[PDB]
Amino acid sequence: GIVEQCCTSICSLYQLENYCN
Amino acid sequence: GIVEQCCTSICSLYQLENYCN
Amino acid sequence: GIVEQCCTSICSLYQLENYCN
Amino acid sequence: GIVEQCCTSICSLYQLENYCN
Amino acid sequence: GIVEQCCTSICSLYQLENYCN
Amino acid sequence: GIVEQCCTSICSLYQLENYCN
Amino acid sequence: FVNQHLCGSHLVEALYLVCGERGFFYTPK
Amino acid sequence: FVNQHLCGSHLVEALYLVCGERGFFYTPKT
Amino acid sequence: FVNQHLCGSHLVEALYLVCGERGFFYTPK
Amino acid sequence: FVNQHLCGSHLVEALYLVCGERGFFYTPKT
Amino acid sequence: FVNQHLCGSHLVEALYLVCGERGFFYTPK
Amino acid sequence: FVNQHLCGSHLVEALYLVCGERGFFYTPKT
Ligand SMILES: [Cl-]
Ligand SMILES: [Cl-]
Ligand SMILES: [Cl-]
Ligand SMILES: [Cl-]
Ligand SMILES: [Cl-]
Ligand SMILES: [Cl-]
Ligand SMILES: [Cl-]
Ligand SMILES: [Cl-]
Ligand SMILES: [Zn+2]
Ligand SMILES: [Zn+2]
Ligand SMILES: [Zn+2]
Ligand SMILES: [Zn+2]
Ligand SMILES: [Zn+2]
Ligand SMILES: [Zn+2]
Ligand SMILES: [Zn+2]
Ligand SMILES: [Zn+2]
Ligand SMILES: [Zn+2]
Ligand SMILES: [Zn+2]
Ligand SMILES: [Zn+2]
């Protein structure tokens, strides 16, 4: 999920975009 | 939608809760 | 005060409401 | 009140300080 | 300027990047 | 720079003002 | 009238607080 | 509602939302 | 005219910074 | 774009910016 | 029309995220 | 004014408030 990927680890812009609709 | 309902008027906490999962 | 209750400890919604006028 | 004074016009830091305790 | 371009219309990430160093 | 002065150390208001244009 | 872009920015912060662990979908259109 | 530690500006924003037209007081030295 | 709800949200953040340890009361009405 | 840890409201704000008119979903328990 | 003061507050947060380590100058006028 | 550590977006917001119409520069790698 997003917390594991972007909060306790770091999300690239491309990875943040995976959570867009 | 949330923009139609909560930008035009102020939504209370209870009205905002509708949009939660 | 609010810092002890809600910042160094956790405030429920009801506890945050104690700081409303 | 603060809304009447600082929403209509931009309040400087000095004007905002009036509202502090 | 950024206010003229990005307050009037919504600037995309790509348009915002113009203002970076 | 600003990170060393104000983020990993503390900036007084006067020190923050050094970063204004 | 309300600035939809600024309104939405505000709304998602409010939903973060209101929804908590439940999360939310933000679907503006 | 979230169940988490709220400090500084995040605490103030939470009070703004929760308190509505009633307003609130933020007294950190109390 | 200014959106009072968005304005107030902004104002209380500004008061947090300006008032510091003194704190403040936010009384919109 | 920043390369840093984004949590809570800061993560939600980043999604709002990145996703634009498409919107997004914030599911913390997933 | 858009509230420039609220718009700018929002814009600098967006620039923080977009610019990252590069930083930015915010020159409203 | 607060006397505290200000980082990231919170530092940028503080500069926006403090600097007013003058604007500011946020250079984190300096
Ligand atoms: Cl706004
Ligand atoms: Cl709201
Ligand atoms: Cl934070
Ligand atoms: Cl709110
Ligand atoms: Cl202000
Ligand atoms: Cl944005
Ligand atoms: Cl933007
Ligand atoms: Cl400000
Ligand atoms: Zn890390
Ligand atoms: Zn805890
Ligand atoms: Zn320290
Ligand atoms: Zn705003
Ligand atoms: Zn915590
Ligand atoms: Zn924060
Ligand atoms: Zn609100
Ligand atoms: Zn980190
Ligand atoms: Zn934006
Ligand atoms: Zn600190
Ligand atoms: Zn302001």
Swiss-Prot record, chains A, B, C, D, E, F:
* Disulfide cysteine pairs (residue numbers): 6-11
Residue spans making up a coiled coil are none
Name of this protein: Insulin A chain
Report the source organism: Homo sapiens
Q: Which gene encodes it?
A: INS
The shown chain, on whole-protein numbering, covers: 90 to 110 of 110
